[PDB]
Subunit: 85 residues, 3 copies
């Protein structure tokens, strides 16, 4: 149990390295966990309201549907600044 | 950019970077190709409260539909819909 | 508007063989449907409360967001016991 503090998760995605990405719908955040990895990272998305779906591409770009704000946001690998689709 | 989304649920991205979104509140699935500024509504019909979306290596799009009732498959090229 | 609820998502995933993975809220389970099998396989997850999402990685490992239990579970292909992440 290496996900910490998850609440009512909405969605899951897995990339080519086995990294798991989860929408923590109840804490308005998106978390990831490497394969066998001990502690999670919170992704630097901002201003989310009920993130719901998640997907990840072969470049490690993470896409999330920000349900409560009627939009979709993405975060490039290693970026601290999302963009809005 | 996406326009007029309402209460979106699932998202999927294929190996070309094209992003598919279940626009759950509007009973449709939309896609946006990498670099395009025009979203496309896929030719599903009859959807109500769709949620999850997936896309296979071939471009067949799968959507959960009518809450827990069904999964609808849209075949690449033909756009034939069938129920899983 | 004293009452405002959210609808829990439903998930679908597809592997490299075209096998389709589906959440089934009503039976609190995740099933898999191989192309032209006429066979619905119930995956041996345990103790699910309204699975909200499913993903499958290149090795056939199946990941599920267990919405009502604030957790993510996984099953490697052929495995009998889920791992909680």
């Amino acid at each position: 149990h290496m996900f910490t503090g998850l609440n009512t998760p909405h969605g899951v995605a897995v990339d080519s390295a086995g990294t798991v990405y989860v929408t923590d719908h109840g804490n308005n955040r998106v978390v990831k966990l490497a394969a066998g990895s001990n502690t999670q990272t919170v992704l630097p998305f901002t201003g989310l309201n009920t993130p719901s779906g998640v997907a990840v591409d072969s470049a490690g770009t993470v896409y999330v549907t920000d349900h409560g704000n009627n939009r979709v946001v993405k975060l490039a690998a290693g970026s601290n600044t999302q963009t809005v689709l």
